[PDB]
Amino acid sequence: AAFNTQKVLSVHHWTDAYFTFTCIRDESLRFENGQFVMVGLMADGKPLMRAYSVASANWEEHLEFFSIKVQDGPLTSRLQHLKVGDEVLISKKPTGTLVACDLNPGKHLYLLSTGTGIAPFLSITKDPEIYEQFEKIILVHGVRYKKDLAYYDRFTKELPEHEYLGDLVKEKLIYYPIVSREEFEHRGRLTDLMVSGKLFEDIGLPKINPQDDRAMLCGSPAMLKDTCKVLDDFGLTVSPKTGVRGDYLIERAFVDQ
């Protein structure tokens, strides 16, 4: 009664560390884009569950998840072996802090992510309502290597032409991939590129200010710590709590061991 069992519909491995899967969505699972649920498997006769951002949008028929693969991680050491037709467990009470309703009004929305932390923004960039709220939405995704830029084709080619969303996306979404460990046009960590001025110059926007710029952050605990400092120094005020407005919102992409 705490979870539903759903059939897996697709599985795609981007790298040795990242994969995407989709599954049937229960008719009762309503959610706000950006929220997370619990996802898992039956293991040793009991559910084995972990928090996962819903990567699909709430208007989409199926669920999508973007997942790490940790070879000695209790869940994903098993989850990495999903096949089409397998069963996964999905919980029933979505929650989380990455909800657009909690943002103060602004002109620009920075979606700042590393690694699998792009996951809630796969959902939010498919929310038609976010595009009316901002003049520009800047999806920043930092990863180690070019191969780790999962969804590169979605954001450079597909989404601007989307039959439902393209008229909203094409003039407003700016995709800013960052690669830290090999040659690339945006090189290093998003924190350094924001402080140095390079990110703003590349995208053609003015420096972040408290009147115009809002953000959502999803990444490692260390990335959140460093990125919060950057935004605080720019003069932004974090939301103190779910349901309370702020200039920016944060959520941990995982918990350190």
Ligand X SMILES: NC(=O)c1ccc[n+]([C@@H]2O[C@H](COP(=O)([O-])OP(=O)(O)OC[C@H]3O[C@@H](n4cnc5c(N)ncnc54)[C@H](OP(=O)(O)O)[C@@H]3O)[C@@H](O)[C@H]2O)c1
Interface contacts to ligand FAD, rule CB under 6 A: 36, 50-53, 66-68, 70, 73-77, 115-116, 119, 251-257
Q: How far is the CB of 30 from Mg ion (least distance, A)?
A: 4
> Of the two residues 63 and 103, which places its CB atom closer to ligand FAD in the complex?
63
> Of the two residues 137 and 190, which places its CB atom closer to ligand X in the complex?
190
> Of the two residues 144 and 252, which places its CB atom closer to ligand X in the complex?
144
Q: How far is the CB of 206 from ligand X (least distance, A)?
A: 22
> Of the two residues 154 and 189, which places its CB atom closer to ligand X in the complex?
189
Tokens standing for 184?
Answer: 């690339």
Using CB under 6 A as the binding rule, whether residue 180 contacts ligand X is answered as: yes
Please give the residues from 33 up to 62 whose contact with Mg ion meets the rule CB under 5 A. Answer: 58
Q: How far is the CB of 40 from ligand FAD (least distance, A)?
A: 9
58 binds, among Mg ion, ligand X, ligand FAD, none (CB under 5 to 8 A by kind): Mg ion
Please give the residues from 55 up to 74 whose contact with ligand X meets the rule CB under 6 A. Answer: 68
Indicate which single residue of 136, 144, 162, 187 sits in contact with ligand X (rule: CB under 6 A): 144
Q: Which stretch binds ligand X (CB under 6 A): 33-41, 99-107, 202-210, 218-226?
A: 218-226
Scan for tokens 């924190």, then name that residue: 191
Q: What is the DSSP string of the chain?
A: --EEEEEEEEEEE-SSSEEEEEEE--TT----TT-EEEEEEEETTEEEEEEEE--S-TTSSEEEEEEE--TT-TTHHHHTT--TT-EEEEES--B-S--GGGBPP-SEEEEEEEGGGGHHHHHHTT-HHHHHH-SEEEEEEEESSGGG-TTHHIIIIIGGG-TTTHHHHTTTEEEEEEESSS--SSBS-HHHHHHTSHHHHHHT-PPP-TTTEEEEEEE-HHHHHHHHHHHHHTT--B-SSTTS-BSEEEEESS---
How many CB atoms neighbour CB 146 within 10 A? 13
- Cβ distance 178 to 186 under 8 Å? yes
Using CB under 5 A as the binding rule, whether residue 30 contacts Mg ion is answered as: yes
Please give the residues from 96 up to 115 whose contact with ligand X meets the rule CB under 6 A. Answer: 114-115
Indicate which single residue of 75, 190, 194, 215 sits in contact with ligand X (rule: CB under 6 A): 190
> Of the two residues 167 and 226, which places its CB atom closer to ligand FAD in the complex?
226
> Of the two residues 27 and 256, which places its CB atom closer to ligand X in the complex?
256
Using CB under 6 A as the binding rule, whether residue 182 contacts ligand X is answered as: no
How many CB atoms neighbour CB 22 within 10 A? 21
Closest Cα to residue 238, out of 257, 212, 208, 210?
A: 210
Binding site for ligand X (CB under 6 A): 17, 68, 114-115, 142-145, 148, 180-181, 189-191, 220, 222-223, 226
